[PDB]
Design a protein around this ligand. Sequence first.
Ligand SMILES: CC/C(=C(\c1ccc(O)cc1)c1ccc(OCCNC)cc1)c1ccccc1
Ligand SMILES: CC/C(=C(\c1ccc(O)cc1)c1ccc(OCCNC)cc1)c1ccccc1
Lengths: 242, 237
Amino acid sequence: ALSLTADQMVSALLDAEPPILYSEYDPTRPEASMMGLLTNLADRELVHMINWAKRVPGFVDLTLHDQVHLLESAWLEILMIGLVWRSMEHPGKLLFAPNLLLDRNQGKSVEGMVEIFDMLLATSSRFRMMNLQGEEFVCLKSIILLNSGVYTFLSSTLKSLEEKDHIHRVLDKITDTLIHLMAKAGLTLQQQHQRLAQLLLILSHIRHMSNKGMEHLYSMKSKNVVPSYDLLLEMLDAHRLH
Amino acid sequence: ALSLTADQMVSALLDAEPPILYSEYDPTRPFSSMMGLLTNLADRELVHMINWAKRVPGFVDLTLHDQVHLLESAWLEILMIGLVWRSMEHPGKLLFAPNLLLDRNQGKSVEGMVEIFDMLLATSSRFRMMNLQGEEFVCLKSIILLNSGVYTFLSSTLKSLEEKDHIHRVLDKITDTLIHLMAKAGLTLQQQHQRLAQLLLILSHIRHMSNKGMEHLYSMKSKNVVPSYDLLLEMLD
Ligand SMILES: CC/C(=C(\c1ccc(O)cc1)c1ccc(OCCNC)cc1)c1ccccc1
Ligand SMILES: CC/C(=C(\c1ccc(O)cc1)c1ccc(OCCNC)cc1)c1ccccc1
């Protein structure tokens, strides 16, 4: 897993991509329905996200507790970068699903999105201006999975030191993979390091948007909206019986 | 400022460093008051932060309104990365000021720090394990200033496009500078790109910690605690 080539890593990540899901509304029927639609869509995406995470090279080498911690920290960032990616070719709008495309004025009335709708649109625009490639996108999504929770392993066991070292080794292999993609494309070494930094700085903005989103979700005080550690544990703690 | 060499950029940033300030308490009186000490310390740091920002190459080429927007987004991240930096050589503790060093158990009783004390300690430990250098630290703090608010200008005027392009040129020049520092130190090209990414990924964690801190500050409902756009505007004028 730490022995994949860059091309093999990219191939693995592309193979592991989850599907784009639909909103569950009757398209023959005529608000506050937006949060209901989004909550339902995110619930169904989360199941596929768990399957995807298990195929990110290196991720299933971690303990199940550490897998759960990472997913707990990252899942809304991962939903949001997917949203931004799908919206890249739809300026001024967010493609929540192929049947749920909203513009900014419509977003103005979506619960919890008073700040974040415009932040997501700006991110999508930035991706378009950089001409972000699918291979780069899947690298960034893997980086979020591995990085977002790594500085909150409040554990100091020998095993935890081993876990963090591994996570940093996988992150390093993804950095190498991103650089290789840029070299294949013919970028100079200076352009490669500049572009690597541009992409990684966007991750800080995705964290920001996720924190603002999570603030809203907790404010709802709805028992099942933020996935619990124990729920994520049940989905990740698979048997081998299938 | 887009014509500085990497070495000149580093010297400029090192020259521009703000001082380390002290907490204001009677060192002869007992101890227990932490949020009051920290809000006062942050208030006095903010004035020096504005002077520092104006010496970050490229920053004053921006409009006043865009300078305010950047500082409004970034100022707690900038305070927090400074805190993490001065705590690097104090494992298990946070050096809020040279006269205000608290351990983890003491942090347990500090308002608003139920989550972020441990997060700041983890960041300091990560800086120590990477052997972060002062030259790298000042580059990262400048990146935070230029990056944190750049995807929230919510403007598409020709002037705004010009402003965003400039911000990214300055960011690109700091990336070049970071890479040059790593090359001077003898890192291979592979080690350079890996270390650049490690450093920039820590910035996401600094954003996380600032958002958690800002949530607590807004919860205080204290009129002067979160600096207003208009207050920052007066200081930046
Ligand atoms: C930014 C849109 C958004 C959400 C979203 C973003 C990308 C997707 O692929 C699917 C849903 C969001 C995500 C999760 C939501 O509820 C969690 C349900 N249990 C996992 C509710 C809404 C939302 C909006 C307001 C507040 C927080 C998130
Ligand atoms: C992490 C410690 C912290 C803060 C701190 C961090 C680094 C410093 O150099 C100085 C102050 C902090 C910062 C700002 C505070 O009030 C803002 C006052 N107007 C600018 C209050 C506390 C704090 C603690 C709880 C909630 C939010 C921030």
